[PDB]
């Protein structure tokens, strides 16, 4: 036929932000908040609180982590 | 002496030499001198006092 008009929406954004840049961007965002995830397990790896509560229950890597010095020649 | 532990001889085996020495506690409720038997806490100390 014959078309007159041009029918078109006007999407959905905050000025610079877009609806469909963000879907378009939002898994390699959750790859970069992996990614962080992993810098903050190597940065905080030597923290005796997040190796008891984290670290060590890893399977192979785990039990590695700690030591085996008796209560006998520990000072304190 | 805590830094003995662990090289040369053990925990147990520290805590008798620093208690064979001697050093100055804190003063007793009528404010004189007093002395205590030493923990793994304290120096090695000299022979002489000065």
Excluded: C
């Amino acid at each position: 036929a014959y078309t007159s008009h041009l029918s078109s929406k006007t999407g959905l954004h905050f000025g610079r932000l877009s609806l469909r840049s963000l879907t378009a961007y939002a898994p390699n965002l959750m790859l970069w908040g992996g990614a962080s995830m992993l810098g903050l397990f190597v940065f905080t790896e030597g923290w005796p609180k997040f190796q008891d509560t984290l670290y060590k229950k890893i399977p192979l890597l785990g039990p590695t982590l700690e030591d085996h010095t008796p209560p006998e020649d520990k000072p304190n | 002496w805590r830094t003995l532990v662990g090289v040369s001889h053990t925990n147990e085996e520290v805590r008798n030499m620093a208690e064979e020495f001697e050093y100055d506690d804190e003063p007793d409720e009528q404010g004189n001198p007093k002395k205590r038997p030493g923990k793994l806490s304290d120096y090695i100390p000299g022979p002489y006092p000065n």
